[PDB]
DNA sequence: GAACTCTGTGGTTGCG
DNA sequence: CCGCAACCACAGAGTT
């Protein structure tokens, strides 16, 4: 599906909503594509930090690359990121040595999420 | 049935 | 004083 580029030349991580509801399914699969080669089964995580939060509390951040695409089942973000701010997450992939993709400013993640107005 | 899970509406409220 | 954009609670309807 939709894609971005990352901080590196040689991954491409699926597209992530402005604006998302915290410990809420995504509306999308997060996918992490390699370009270059990365041996089956290789480990990807990935982790939200920010200026405000360090390292928000995730879930489901771990998968395998399976044929050059780590697809993550359901994803989701428990920790806020903040009254006006987004998440800016790290792709780290686990070959020796680890290689490492980041997505600034990706997401926001507030309790309520996106809401009609009042 | 109890105990979750999910998603929307209502009550509040600092900070512009 | 107005409102946005957040937080907190929780109701209703499904699930496990």
């Known amino acids: 599906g939709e894609l971005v580029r990352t901080d590196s030349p040689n991954f491409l991580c699926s597209v992530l909503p402005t604006h998302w ?18 041996p089956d089964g290789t480990l990807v995580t990935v982790m939200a930090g920010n200026d405000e939060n360090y ?27 903040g009254r006006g701010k987004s998440f800016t997450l790290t792709i780290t992939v686990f070959t020796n040595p680890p290689q490492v993709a980041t997505y600034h400013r990706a997401i926001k993640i507030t309790v309520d999420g996106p809401r009609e107005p009042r």
Do not use: H
């Open 21 to 38: 509801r915290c410990n809420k399914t995504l509306p999308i699969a997060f996918k992490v594509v390699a370009l270059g080669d990365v």
């Open 55 to 81: 390292s928000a509390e995730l879930r489901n951040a771990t998968a395998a690359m399976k044929n050059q695409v780590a697809r993550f089942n359901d994803l989701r973000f428990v920790g806020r990121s």
